[PDB]
Design a protein around this ligand. Structure first.
Ligand code: CL
Ligand code: CL
Ligand code: CL
Ligand code: CL
Ligand code: CL
Ligand code: CL
Ligand code: K
Ligand code: MG
Ligand code: MG
Ligand code: MG
Ligand code: MG
Ligand code: MG
Ligand code: MG
Ligand code: MG
Ligand code: MG
Ligand code: MG
Ligand code: MG
Ligand code: MG
Ligand code: MG
Ligand code: MG
Ligand code: MG
Ligand code: MG
Ligand code: MG
Ligand code: MG
Ligand code: MG
Ligand code: MG
Ligand code: MG
Ligand code: MG
Ligand code: MG
Ligand code: MG
Ligand code: MG
Ligand code: MG
Ligand code: NA
Ligand code: NA
Ligand code: NA
Ligand code: NA
Ligand code: NA
Ligand code: NA
Ligand code: NA
Ligand code: NA
Ligand code: NA
Ligand code: NA
Ligand code: NA
Ligand code: NA
Ligand code: NA
Ligand code: NA
Ligand code: NA
Ligand code: NA
Ligand code: NA
Ligand code: NA
Ligand code: NA
Ligand code: NA
Ligand code: NA
Ligand code: SR
Ligand code: SR
Ligand code: SR
Ligand code: SR
Ligand code: SR
Ligand code: SR
Ligand code: SR
Ligand code: SR
Ligand code: SR
Ligand code: SR
Ligand code: SR
Ligand code: SR
Ligand code: SR
Ligand code: SR
Ligand code: SR
Ligand code: SR
Ligand code: SR
Ligand code: SR
Ligand code: SR
Ligand code: SR
Ligand code: SR
Ligand code: SR
Ligand code: SR
Ligand code: SR
Ligand code: SR
Lengths: 154, 160, 95, 92, 186
RNA sequence: ACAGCUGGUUCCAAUCGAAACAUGUCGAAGCAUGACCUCCGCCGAGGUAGUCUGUGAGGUAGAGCGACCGAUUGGUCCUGUCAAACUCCAAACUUACAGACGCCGUUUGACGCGGGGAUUCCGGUGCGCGGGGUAAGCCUGUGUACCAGGAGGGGAACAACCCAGAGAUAGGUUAAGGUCCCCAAGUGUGGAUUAAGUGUAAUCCUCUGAAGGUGG
RNA sequence: UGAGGCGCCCAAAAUGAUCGGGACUCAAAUCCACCACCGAGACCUGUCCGUACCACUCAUACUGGUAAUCGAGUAGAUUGG
RNA sequence: GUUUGACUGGGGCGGUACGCGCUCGAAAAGAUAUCGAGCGCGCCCUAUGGCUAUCUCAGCCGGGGACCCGGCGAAGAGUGCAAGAGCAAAAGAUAGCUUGACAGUGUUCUUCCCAACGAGGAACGCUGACGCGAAAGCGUGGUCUAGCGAACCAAUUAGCCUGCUUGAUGCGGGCAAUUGAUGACAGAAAAGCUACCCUAGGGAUAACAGAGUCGUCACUCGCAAGAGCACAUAUCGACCGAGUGGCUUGCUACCUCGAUGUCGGUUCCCUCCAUCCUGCCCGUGCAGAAGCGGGCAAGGGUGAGGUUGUUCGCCUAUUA
RNA sequence: UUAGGCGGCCACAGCGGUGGGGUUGCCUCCCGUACCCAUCCCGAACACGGAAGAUAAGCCCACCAGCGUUCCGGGGAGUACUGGAGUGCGCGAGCCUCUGGGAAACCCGGUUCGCCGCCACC
């Protein structure tokens, strides 16, 4: 399971690439979604590779982001362990995080919006003109690299 | 006519003689110099002139450089010296010139040039350890008459 | 294009690979397809008659009946539905 | 090109193949009593006469065949599309 | 053979065994094919149908299995050819086959020949086959009369082994009689 | 008088939102029919902008030609070269159909169908691929995003380069870009090179700097 | 004797020189890394408005609900004032 | 009284990219432009059409550029004509026979990718009648893609409908289709001048000038063959290669057509240096005098006259 | 399939070569022209009639790789080329990095001297 965050805006990006992001439920910069590692999904992230940051987050990090940015399919009801327990097939955020990372369920299945609307990266990110290996923030990240980014955008 | 007009590969390959007429003759006198009855294998030293940039070289330039190169080898090793040099490229690319404004501008045929990719050997000589510095000096003169910068690379020759 | 005839720009698609040259095997010229069957359209260079417009080479239509020995194949050209008359010789079952 | 004066072919009248004779269509003579003839006299006067002031058009490099096919047994003829032919000579 | 661009004919063509152009025309009927073939000593009739991985023979008869019904005579002649077609035909009727088109392969459409006898035989068995009566040898020749009269110009028995001296087209009748009959064990 | 030509045509707001192309035209400063925009009605469950897989289509890049074809060296098999109108080979990729996943649709009715109303048929730029031309802020294609009709931030200024698509108002954090002063943020850290004020200039009509040479 | 980095020569134009300017030389240059910051209407967040849709309704009157998947616009189409 | 067309790196001239077909341009589905590259069609053929039987071609080798025999030979032959493509017990050849190059009426695709549009074309059916073949089957012309033409009118083919109260006769009107042309080829019947001019507009489009470009022009540099009696480099300097300028010329059509007045000259002011003189230098094929070449250098100077509107230039006497 | 017929794929099947196989069986070569039929002349072929001989052809079985072809390994080569992205480099033609794909020639070693279907048959 990979966490996907759009880091580059829609202006001037190929339409078929913008549509791909929308099919992955991301319609804004800094919006994040969790995608199963399938051959079908793999082609999609590969196509959006130059306008996004992605990788597999750690259990803890996922839990931090879910607690802080997860939302109900509809409504403003805050999502905490109690919400999780009283609305999902899990006991608390941790149980959800584990099931997601192991690809057993999806935010939608559990009555949660497929998107995590993150905050701008505190302290800024590594730039959107170069990939990770070159010192930028675009492309596939380390579990640690992805964790660093997601946390800065908690 | 300046080479700036043709040195670049900015046009389709234009070589088909079945669809092109009036092609001027090449000014290249010879492609094999020195003792052509002998093999390049029979020599201890082999030095080539390598073109550093991809370019087109008009037959007029190939002849000037080759001439000034071989000319030196003859003056230093003799009109029969024990050496052999080869110009391995041939001017297959036909060139035009639009010599009436931009209307129906397809140019008339005015010459030929050889396309050379960077890193390729334009010339290659084979000599004896003695005349090694003479072939190197012939190439110094040759590359001064062709567009790109060149490398004078020594192939077989561990007599440094 | 310099001209607009039906065979304009068909040098490649209507020429046989050297070894496929010569009269083609009769088996496929006699093949029978059922209505609804998906069939790929591809003119056989060696078979003169029963061809469709070269522009349709590569389509994968649906047999929706026949006319004489030829088959009526349904396709969608861009956004427009068209019916193509074609003999088995220029058809192949899909999958 | 050459054309046989007679040959077997379909007679749309007998409704079966029979021998026919081919003949070039000869122009029939006009009477001068058709409506168009009366219209020209009525509509022509002082000055220009519209369509009636126009003169004969040109010619095509080659004309199409213009023949009659007459059934050798029922005597009736039928027409057919013609085909461009520089010259048409009958054999026999 | 010569190189990459060399064109080798289909196998059955190299072997000079199948006329593919005639085959195509044959298959265009949609009907089964009465495959008539002949050897120096024997004659074979097969009812073939088209198939995914190759042809399908639905019924057949060889001149050899003729003795099986009382034939002590040779097998490379007219009476043999006819009766062989009739047997194959009868068996064809058994398997459900009702019509056919004559496929004489690389043999010639010679009037009165054996491939045509095989066809008249198959037709009499009740099979519907597009044909032409005046291309078939006349009844007597089918019976084997032409060979009887030949043995008439005797002086030395036509047949080596002794099946008979002046031969017997009447034997043809017996066998045909035996086949047209129902009892027969096809 | 007529004009297919120039000018002008007066109040507020809300929803959607082009075409600068195709066919025909005494047609190219105009029209009509399409494409595309919009409105209304009908229909009733699927649809397909993305990806993967399967079954097919293709000969461009590259490569090669003791594989055709036609060019193109020398020596007494070898040895030297090529192709827009060559191909024994052969991609990336584009493309037909189907399944799967995704997204979407069944009160927001999708897809499709019928009808009313148009505007439009001088386009431009960047990038990729081009063809012509010495070249051009040149001419003429093609795919795409942008300007046109796109604010706001940056780029000295600056239609289309970068960030960015934007209801009002407010707090906060970033983006591009920047942190010696002009001007918000470093006269930041570890280290090396440069002595020419080289340089302090992503892109560019706009920022030059070449062949050649250098015991700096 | 080979290779690499920066620089030097090659290097001429018309009203007043220029990296935007000042001006900068163990840099305020260049290259390799790193640290901390500034900086939009973007993104996050409070309230309100419009619009679409939903529930209730005679209502397109109130009231309540949903919008991560609504909010720029020339020609033009549609509608309330 | 009118017409005298359109396209076009402005227009005219030239040309036709004004109706069609092929290869390439075209970027591996389809579509795709330029006065883009190569080149064709406006017919021809009663067989050079159709079927059947028999058969296998270029070319080369061996035996007696004509003939005969044998071997090799997937296709280089032939197939009317461009090109690309198709074809070998054939789509080619020979022989024989035949008239399907047939009548009626459709489906579909094309014309016109997508996406509406006529004529024309093609593939594929049904019905009728036929040809050849044993039969399957083949034949809706020539292996495939060019060889084409609306309405009105006329002539023609076969049958039928109809013409003003009514009957007969004459002569008309009509249903279906064939042929006759509009090549400006989706169709007007059609020549020029205007400096005597006029209007509407256009920087949608030219002339001067600006701007871009720099082939041209000017100037420079690299290499240095060659000669300079010997001697590359005192001096002259081919070939080829690399540049700078924006004085010449060309190209483009970006600005300007509700006007930015032209060439030359004159007068008056500022500037550039690639320097003609003057200052200071280096070399010399530098004795001197003087030449010749080179370097720094833009302070100052660079004048008067003859022809010609001339710029430029040719010419004269002065001049550092 | 101890030798046959009809095929599908259409060289992995071609080219060339070696070895083996047939008394009433099979296929052939083979013998022979009264008939059906036949040769612009030839019973050569086509057609018909038939068994004295033969396994020399063909054919079938076993096999060989030199040429041609198919596929595979290792090398060439993750090279050439390339879809997406970049305030990366270069005076510039052009190049580079990240991401996703990925040849061809040729060399060397294997594979390939057909596979499969239906029917009939000591
Ligand atoms: Cl079609
Ligand atoms: Cl006539
Ligand atoms: Cl046989
Ligand atoms: Cl927007
Ligand atoms: Cl300074
Ligand atoms: Cl209001
Ligand atoms: K003006
Ligand atoms: Mg929500
Ligand atoms: Mg940054
Ligand atoms: Mg092509
Ligand atoms: Mg308003
Ligand atoms: Mg309102
Ligand atoms: Mg290439
Ligand atoms: Mg506008
Ligand atoms: Mg400050
Ligand atoms: Mg400077
Ligand atoms: Mg900040
Ligand atoms: Mg008038
Ligand atoms: Mg005009
Ligand atoms: Mg194409
Ligand atoms: Mg008329
Ligand atoms: Mg007439
Ligand atoms: Mg027209
Ligand atoms: Mg047209
Ligand atoms: Mg006026
Ligand atoms: Mg303007
Ligand atoms: Mg203009
Ligand atoms: Mg100076
Ligand atoms: Mg002196
Ligand atoms: Mg001065
Ligand atoms: Mg043997
Ligand atoms: Mg740069
Ligand atoms: Na074929
Ligand atoms: Na009148
Ligand atoms: Na008027
Ligand atoms: Na336009
Ligand atoms: Na127009
Ligand atoms: Na107009
Ligand atoms: Na679906
Ligand atoms: Na390329
Ligand atoms: Na826009
Ligand atoms: Na600004
Ligand atoms: Na400076
Ligand atoms: Na509007
Ligand atoms: Na006119
Ligand atoms: Na002209
Ligand atoms: Na039509
Ligand atoms: Na100029
Ligand atoms: Na210049
Ligand atoms: Na003046
Ligand atoms: Na001065
Ligand atoms: Na004078
Ligand atoms: Na044998
Ligand atoms: Sr070019
Ligand atoms: Sr050079
Ligand atoms: Sr009158
Ligand atoms: Sr008159
Ligand atoms: Sr004429
Ligand atoms: Sr909108
Ligand atoms: Sr393409
Ligand atoms: Sr500092
Ligand atoms: Sr430092
Ligand atoms: Sr400018
Ligand atoms: Sr630059
Ligand atoms: Sr340099
Ligand atoms: Sr709004
Ligand atoms: Sr709006
Ligand atoms: Sr002009
Ligand atoms: Sr035909
Ligand atoms: Sr005149
Ligand atoms: Sr005058
Ligand atoms: Sr003005
Ligand atoms: Sr100076
Ligand atoms: Sr002086
Ligand atoms: Sr003069
Ligand atoms: Sr014999
Ligand atoms: Sr340059
Ligand atoms: Sr791979």
């Amino acid at each position: 399971m990979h966490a996907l965050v759009q880091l580059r805006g829609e202006v001037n990006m190929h339409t078929d690439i913008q549509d791909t992001l929308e099919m992955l439920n991301i319609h804004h910069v800094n919006h994040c979604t969790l995608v199963p590692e399938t051959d079908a999904y793999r082609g999609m992230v590969a196509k959006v590779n130059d306008f996004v940051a992605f990788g597999e987050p750690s259990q803890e990090t996922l839990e931090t982001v879910l607690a802080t940015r997860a939302e109900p399919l509809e409504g403003d009801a805050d999502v905490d362990d109690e919400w999780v327990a009283e609305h999902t097939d899990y006991d608390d955020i941790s149980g959800l995080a584990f099931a997601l990372l192991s690809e057993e369920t999806t935010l939608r299945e559990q009555g949660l919006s497929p998107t995590l609307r993150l905050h701008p990266p505190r302290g800024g990110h590594d730039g959107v003109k170069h990939p990770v290996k070159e010192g930028g923030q675009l492309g596939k990240h380390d579990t640690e690299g992805i964790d660093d980014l997601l946390e800065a955008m908690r | 006519k300046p080479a700036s007009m043709y040195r670049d590969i900015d046009k389709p390959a234009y070589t088909r003689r079945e669809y092109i007429t009036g092609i001027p003759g090449s000014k290249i006198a010879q492609h094999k110099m020195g003792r052509k009855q002998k093999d390049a294998d029979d020599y201890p030293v082999q030095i080539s002139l390598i073109v550093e940039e991809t370019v087109q070289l008009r037959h007029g330039s190939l002849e000037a450089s080759r001439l000034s190169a071989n000319r030196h080898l003859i003056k230093e090793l003799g009109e029969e010296g024990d050496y052999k040099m080869t110009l391995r490229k041939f001017p297959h690319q036909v060139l035009r010139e639009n010599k009436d404004g931009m209307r129906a501008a397809f140019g008339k045929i005015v010459g030929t040039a050889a396309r050379v990719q960077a890193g390729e050997q334009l010339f290659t000589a084979y000599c004896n350890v003695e005349d090694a510095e003479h072939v190197k000096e012939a190439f110094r003169r040759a590359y001064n008459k062709i567009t790109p910068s060149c490398r004078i690379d020594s192939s077989p020759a561990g007599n440094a | 294009p310099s001209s607009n005839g039906p065979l304009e720009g068909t040098r490649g698609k209507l020429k046989n690979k050297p070894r496929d040259r010569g009269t083609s095997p009769p088996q496929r010229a006699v093949e029978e397809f059922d209505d609804g069957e998906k069939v790929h359209l591809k003119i056989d260079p060696s078979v003169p008659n029963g061809r469709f417009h070269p522009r349709f080479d590569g389509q994968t239509g649906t047999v929706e009946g026949k006319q004489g020995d030829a088959y009526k194949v349904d396709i969608v050209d861009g956004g427009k539905e068209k019916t193509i008359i074609v003999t088995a010789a220029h058809l192949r079952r899909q999958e | 090109m050459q054309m046989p004066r007679r040959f077997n072919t379909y007679c749309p009248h007998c409704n079966e193949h029979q021998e026919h004779e081919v003949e070039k269509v000869r122009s029939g003579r006009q009477t001068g009593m058709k409506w168009i003839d009366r219209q020209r006299e009525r509509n022509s006067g002082i000055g220009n006469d519209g369509k009636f002031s126009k003169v004969p058009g040109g010619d095509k490099p080659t004309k199409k065949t213009d023949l009659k096919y007459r059934c050798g047994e029922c005597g009736k003829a039928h027409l057919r599309e013609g085909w461009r032919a520089g010259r048409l000579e009958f054999q026999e | 053979a010569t190189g990459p661009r060399y064109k080798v004919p289909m196998r059955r063509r190299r072997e000079a065994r199948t006329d593919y152009h005639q085959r195509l025309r044959l298959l265009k009927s949609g009907k089964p094919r009465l495959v008539a073939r002949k050897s120096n000593k024997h004659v074979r009739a097969q009812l073939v149908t088209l198939g995914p991985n190759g042809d399908d023979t639905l019924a057949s008869a060889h001149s050899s299995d003729l003795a099986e019904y009382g034939w002590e005579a040779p097998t490379g002649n007219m009476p043999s050819a006819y009766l062989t077609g009739l047997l194959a035909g009868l068996r064809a009727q058994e398997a459900g086959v009702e019509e056919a088109v004559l496929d004489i392969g690389l043999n010639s459409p010679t009037p009165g020949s054996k491939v045509f006898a095989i066809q008249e035989g198959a037709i009499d068995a009740g099979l519907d086959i597009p044909h032409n009566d005046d291309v078939l040898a006349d009844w007597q020749r089918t019976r084997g009369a032409h060979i009887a009269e030949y043995d008439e110009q005797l002086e030395e028995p036509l047949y080596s082994g002794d099946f008979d001296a002046a031969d017997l087209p009447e034997h043809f009748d017996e066998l045909r009689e035996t086949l047209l009959d129902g009892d027969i064990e096809l």
